Amino acid sequence: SRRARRIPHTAESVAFPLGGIGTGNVSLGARGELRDWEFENLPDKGRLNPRSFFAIHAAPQGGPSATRVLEARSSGRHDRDAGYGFDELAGLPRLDSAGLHGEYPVVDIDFTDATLPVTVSLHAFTPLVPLDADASGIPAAVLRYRVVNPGDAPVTVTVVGSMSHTAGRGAPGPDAPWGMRGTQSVRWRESDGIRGLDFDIDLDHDDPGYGTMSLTTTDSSTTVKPQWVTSYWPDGARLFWNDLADDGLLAPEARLTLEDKPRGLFAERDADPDAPALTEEQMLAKLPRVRTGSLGIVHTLAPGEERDFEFVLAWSFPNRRRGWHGHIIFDDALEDGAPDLRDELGPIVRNHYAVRWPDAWAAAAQLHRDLPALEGATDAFVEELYGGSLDPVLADAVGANIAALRSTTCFVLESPTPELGDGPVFAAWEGSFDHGGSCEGTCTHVWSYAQTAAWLFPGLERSARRAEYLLETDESGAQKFRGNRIFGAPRWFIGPAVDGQLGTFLRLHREWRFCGDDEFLRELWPAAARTLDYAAREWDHDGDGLLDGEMHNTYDIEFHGVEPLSNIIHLAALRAGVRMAGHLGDTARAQEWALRADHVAAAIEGVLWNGEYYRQVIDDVDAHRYQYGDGVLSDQLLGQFHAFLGGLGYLLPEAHVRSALDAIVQHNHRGDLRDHESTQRVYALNDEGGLLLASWPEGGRPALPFVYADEVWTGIEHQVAVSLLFAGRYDDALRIERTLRARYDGAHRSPWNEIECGNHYARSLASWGLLIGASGAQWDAGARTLSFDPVLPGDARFLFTTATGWGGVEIGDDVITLRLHGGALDLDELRLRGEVAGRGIHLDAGETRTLTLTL
Amino acid sequence: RRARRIPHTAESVAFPLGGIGTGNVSLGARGELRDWEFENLPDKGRLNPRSFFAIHAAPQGGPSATRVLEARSSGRHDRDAGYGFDELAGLPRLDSAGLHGEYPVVDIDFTDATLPVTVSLHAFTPLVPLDADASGIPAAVLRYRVVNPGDAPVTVTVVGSMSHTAGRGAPGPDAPWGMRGTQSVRWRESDGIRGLDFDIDLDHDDPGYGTMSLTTTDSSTTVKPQWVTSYWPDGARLFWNDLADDGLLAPEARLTLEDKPRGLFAERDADPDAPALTEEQMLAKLPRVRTGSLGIVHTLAPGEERDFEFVLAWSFPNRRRGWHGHIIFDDALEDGAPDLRDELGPIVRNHYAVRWPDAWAAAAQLHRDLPALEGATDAFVEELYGGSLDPVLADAVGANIAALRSTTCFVLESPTPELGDGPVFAAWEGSFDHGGSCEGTCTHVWSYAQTAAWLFPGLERSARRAEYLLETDESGAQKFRGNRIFGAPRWFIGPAVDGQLGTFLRLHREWRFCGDDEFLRELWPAAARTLDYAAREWDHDGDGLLDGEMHNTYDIEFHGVEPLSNIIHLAALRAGVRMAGHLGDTARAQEWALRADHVAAAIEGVLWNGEYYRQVIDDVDAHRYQYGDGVLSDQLLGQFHAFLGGLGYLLPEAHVRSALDAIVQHNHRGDLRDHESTQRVYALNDEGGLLLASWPEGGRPALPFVYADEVWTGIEHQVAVSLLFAGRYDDALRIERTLRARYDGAHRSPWNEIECGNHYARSLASWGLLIGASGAQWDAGARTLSFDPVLPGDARFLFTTATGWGGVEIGDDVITLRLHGGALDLDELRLRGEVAGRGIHLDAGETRTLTLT
Ligand SMILES: OC[C@H]1O[C@@H](O)[C@@H](O)[C@@H]1O
Ligand SMILES: OC[C@H]1O[C@@H](O)[C@@H](O)[C@@H]1O
Ligand SMILES: OC[C@H]1O[C@@H](O)[C@@H](O)[C@@H]1O
Ligand SMILES: OC[C@H]1O[C@@H](O)[C@@H](O)[C@@H]1O
Ligand SMILES: OC[C@H]1O[C@@H](O)[C@@H](O)[C@@H]1O
Ligand SMILES: [Cl-]
Ligand SMILES: [Cl-]
Ligand SMILES: [Cl-]
Ligand SMILES: [Mg+2]
Ligand SMILES: [Mg+2]
Ligand SMILES: [Mg+2]
Ligand SMILES: [Mg+2]
Ligand SMILES: [Mg+2]
Ligand SMILES: [Mg+2]
Ligand SMILES: [Mg+2]
Ligand SMILES: [Mg+2]
Ligand SMILES: [Mg+2]
Ligand SMILES: [Mg+2]
Ligand SMILES: [Mg+2]
Ligand SMILES: [Mg+2]
Ligand SMILES: [Mg+2]
Ligand SMILES: [Mg+2]
Ligand SMILES: [Mg+2]
């Protein structure tokens, strides 16, 4: 019995990512293969790790043995240009089928095979502990193979992991013989309560490419080949399979190379033949530089017996080259006016995880030592996220997209700049191209959509807000939307985006509301208030209160005229600003902004509202390229998404907000795209559906609309779905999410990778809002109040988080129950549907309280 | 349709257009162009921006339809940044398609539920047997046939949009926007054709320089010669607006919609109040690829079919001098041959550039000569695919021609003065996706390749000249990878036994095909030395059998005494006696004939085990990479050559058949799911194939040779050919059915058999299937042509000879020759060992039917 939908081994795009926040990753495919080896501070989809696989030797008592790689057979194209290569070991026998059942962060892959005399499943995960970014940021994974004997005789089983270290690649050069800038090492090690293989490399400690790996177990019943033979030809693999398939046991290799000297095709041109053998060490110095080892675990299973064969795979690449080194913020794109600290600071910035764990073994030792608590938290998380009342579609959308936050798109730097003081700083690309970062600078117009980190790892988001307000905001309140100064470099010379700058203000409110830390807010307040004032002063040119004229946005273009994206975000920002200003005692600003907001709201209703939705008012929709006029913009109510999430309620008349959301769905949602015409980028096509960025149901399409109008972005789908949940439009929210997640169901794209400008795209983290909207969760740390208001009536059960603690809430039978899995919770009031359920509620981790509602 | 329908869902399938040495572009089973590789390197997976065909169909008094002329995509859609702008993946397409390939011709039939017309694409690059230049045009026909099945007229526009491919450079100040030069496109009408002519402002001798064109002879055109270039993709949007509006196009009044760099594209250091930029100045700051559209417009009556015919041509005439590969490095060279490179200069030209120095020249030729070129191509297809061969065998023979016309092979114009003026054939072993695989016209690989020797023999002769005149030393040591064609010093690695002696067998093959004794005499001093080298240097125990360490195609050395080396040597000696005796080299004729009889006796006394031939060695594990009493699939490779060379059986017939039977019985696998290989994979899962070796009687080494557990199509082919000659038809057919099933489109492409690279040269062993099936024996010296089909009864085959090619049709009482090209002047025609005619002459276009009594 599996709760998650079975994804077949034929679904080639599927990749379940292991790893945690900022650690880099390796993934499991639906065949149970390891893939996408990307530990080294850059994405690397498709990177093959030579000779890195799990295998089984099953020896039935009195029967023929079977030796297989623990993967389902490949399918689809087999036309590799040089065949599947030696180091892929594609020619070893594999299993009939598999089914992958992912409830991120946990996966189960159940193998089926008619020849193997045992049945195998893989359970794998990297712990996720809500509100604990370090515990959720271990550079390691559990790979636990459960083996069952369904037969009638005992079977002696060996499960063996064979692994190469990934470190050391280099571009052709005198420093990179054999494509490797250093020689790897591997050794058997037993220390720190664990045992297994410890990999290293003789690169300098400060080399960006320096790193370690380990494959370990706490199981005493091991058989090992610590280092495979390194020859010119792949003798090592052949000898490994001979050794395993013979007896299910392994031995260390007596000779680490079978070469005596360079010979034949490998001979040195200027070499004397009849020259005698070199020593083993001299010969190894001339040979390939990757090392491989095998760790086996051996147990005999009686008929009906089940046993776990448990491994940890760990890694460490502590060093990043200082700087984004992206594709936007080049030296010819820096402004002066902020001094360049980069010389004065080292050329390396460390990954935060490398402070706690100096190398791979340290991370493995911790994961193994603390496994019961780390796994127990992870399991409690999974049960609350996937085992509650949410439609499975919504739980899928919320949980699967956490992978983006734990992907190469995001990372955590240790003390990159003295301007922020000491400690970790979260930063991120927008996305991950297959082999490089996409769109540097913790881009504010994109990241404003992302909600997941604000509810699961709020300290990360706070650390980023500090960078924006302390480093990227000038004295006028102009804020950059890509941040370069985290690295001690000058700012990017491009100026503000309206969505970026005002969405960052909204996020400051969100962060402050979650944590209740007025000192956090006070530090950033002079800068933040300037960025809100900047809008009314600089972006309203006709004095009506509506932002108007040329403003840059997340569509990489400027809107002209007067339109809702900018204005409804501004309205939301003003309302948030009143809450913050008022609480801090900035009473003058609070009253000014409240009155401004009232005017903005009336002007939006008077000008942008058309009786059905909000739209762009412009003299001539074709005067400027890249406009939309009377089209329906899916993001017209983005401000209202933030407002709902921020506890600010409706910004505009409820019937008009619901009308506009209904118009977005009715006009912009496509169930099928056969008849769609787009010259734009494709994230949805053919017999898929999706929410278009814009459409023109009443005409008025420009010759050249904004450049993404005909596209489908999951982040925009999510935000609209969220708003629909808050507005009571459940069926339409579910329609949007079912349609979107169908595009990511494994058939054509992976559930764990929603894409836009890059894999693991930050905008996809809008999805967390589905949980908040479905549950009506409103946590106000300043007031110490928690309320719920589920979209659907009757019984409900959801995950929730707050700054102090996390757990489950269960509603129904005229009661409300809180169960706290981590931290603490101290509530002045708990409300349900606007009514007080209880006062003065104090819980610690492991406790539950059930309150009966008033009749 | 005669060819099997491959569905549009078969993503690996790619039908390659282009010819010998031209570079290529392919059509996938969706009808899409893919694998743009014109520029003297492979480039599988290269996307050409904004390069596609579209249709506008405007029913009289009905709503119009505008579609890209491609079937819907399928499979994985998880591109990291989505399908990009320039792929135009979001435009409406046709529901489905079926691809019917009889290489060199393809038909792609589209199906759509709503389009008001039906469409098919017929495409080809001509192939004219025995005419390598006519088969080497850097152009293709793309002929869209549109049918109006309705009862009202429909006005149809078929429009080709294209971008030139030239100009890429590594990111840097030298390649703004990824481009080292700026492209140009214009409307042109000259040389009897019209359409779009593309160029680039790179220097005339730049390796990256080239041209492209999209042309028609149809007078009914509508054109947008140059799309708008903006920072954003305004060009494509304006194109589709223009096509979908009315099915007609216009030139763009403005070639960019930018006035100056602004916003995200602003120059930080730009004077914010600078003088206005001209259009030409603004273009200079913008992407450097250019795109144009050529439309053909016709109103189709109810029931009417009309062809919308285009030619796509290209020309990248300049190659860097050298292989620039991954084996023959400038510090892997030996001294002793003069380095001519500084004198000759850094470029060598493609031979096709002599006739066709730009794209328009090639197009103009293809259009002008299309009736003759297409007629020859069509006759070729009818003979190869429309005769009596089992369709599996016709598929294996014909589809693999693609390797010869791929990036694996090329033809240099006068690369070295040491060979005199004219074309020189040279080749990789294969094509990696983005680079050549294994340079040097590798002789141990190319010895398996038969297709060029029967279809384009002059190419093979030019390569033999390089090997004997440039790569053979005074001792008779021949290199197996050639550098001297470029004027470069020789590779330092020494000879391979299969390569050196296989080349000698190919010299005999070439000479027998062409009958030119001057060709043979020029090469004879060197060639004779290479055969004598073997008995002198490779037989250490003086028993006549080659023994000890010898390098081979498996990239290792066999030790002991074994049949691959020895049976090839036997074959080469028999060929040597034929050549020596004809030349009047009576000394060598007698010496080699004695040596050959001794070798045959010794093979039978030592290597034969009563069932097959095997390696005799003290300890199969003493040296890595041996095989001992295993069954080596290539053990009778020499006999494959002998059969094709008219030398018959080398060893007792029953022994040769027993060995072949052992190879089939022991090495052929119907299913590979339980196979245990740590080697490379060209066959797996529920596929079958012929393993390189197996150990049915035990004696498997711990570390056998490094490819023993693999499956190579070239070795499947050679064994299947030998089985045909030995009368083991059913087993040959099973081998071929099993291997071609691996390339049926479900997992791999029919037109790309793989080994160390795509389009692998060893796969050209497949031609021998036609030879074996038909029993064709052409001896130009004797002017005799004979056939001896494996199967009884009526038969109909393609054949080739030096002078002419066509079809042979065999019946009970008669044999018919139909000649499609050239001429045939036979001393004697034989069928099944009997004389069928004497003094028979035919010219192209003639048919003669001769009585067998
Ligand atoms: O296409 C890349 C190719 O380059 C060589 O290293 C091949 O092994 C590989 O497949
Ligand atoms: O896909 C669009 C996104 O990609 C980047 O250019 C961003 O600026 C933009 O929001
Ligand atoms: O579905 C019919 C088409 O009409 C336009 O709105 C397109 O988006 C849509 O796909
Ligand atoms: O595949 C890697 C990615 O790098 C960037 O150029 C993207 O366009 C591309 O898709
Ligand atoms: O696939 C094997 C082939 O690849 C190259 O190394 C050739 O030498 C060899 O014959
Ligand atoms: Cl946190
Ligand atoms: Cl404009
Ligand atoms: Cl020729
Ligand atoms: Mg890649
Ligand atoms: Mg170490
Ligand atoms: Mg063993
Ligand atoms: Mg202004
Ligand atoms: Mg205004
Ligand atoms: Mg549907
Ligand atoms: Mg589908
Ligand atoms: Mg509600
Ligand atoms: Mg590629
Ligand atoms: Mg020109
Ligand atoms: Mg038009
Ligand atoms: Mg001997
Ligand atoms: Mg299949
Ligand atoms: Mg005549
Ligand atoms: Mg004549």
Which short descriptors sum up this protein?
19 helices; binds beta-D-arabinofuranose; 24% strand; 9-stranded antiparallel sheet; globular; alpha+beta; hydrolase; 855 residues; Maltose phosphorylase, domain 3; Glycosyltransferase; 3 domains
As for the number of domains of chain A, it is 3
CATH topology of the largest domain in chain A: Glycosyltransferase
Portion of residues within helices of chain A: 25-40%
Which small-molecule ligands are present, each listed once?
beta-D-arabinofuranose, chloride ion, magnesium ion
- Beta fraction of the residues of chain A? 15-25%
Instruction: Determine the most extensive contact between two protein chains.
Output: A-B, 86 and 83 residues
> What is the first-to-last residue Cα distance of chain A?
40 Å
Number of helices of chain A: 19
C-alpha-based Rg of chain A, rounded: 29 Å
Number of separate strands of chain A: 36
In this structure, how is the largest beta sheet of chain A organized? 9 strands, antiparallel
Oligomeric composition of the shown chains: homodimer
The helix/strand class of chain A is alpha+beta
CATH class group of the largest domain in chain A: Mainly Alpha
Question: Can you tell me about this structure?
Answer:
Chain A has 855 residues and is of the alpha+beta class. Chain A folds into three domains: 7-318, Beta-galactosidase, Chain A, domain 5 (Distorted Sandwich), CATH 2.70.98; 331-357 and 389-775, Glycosyltransferase (Alpha/alpha barrel); 778-852, Maltose phosphorylase, domain 3 (Sandwich). Chain A contains 19 helices and 36 strands. In chain A, the strands form ten sheets. Chain A has a nine-stranded antiparallel sheet. In chain A, strands 30, 31, 32, 33, 34, 35 and 36 form a seven-stranded mixed sheet that branches. In chain A, strand 24 and strand 25 (558-559) form a beta hairpin. Chains A and B meet through helix 1 and strand 22 of A and helix 1 and strand 22 of B. One magnesium ion binds next to loops of chain A.
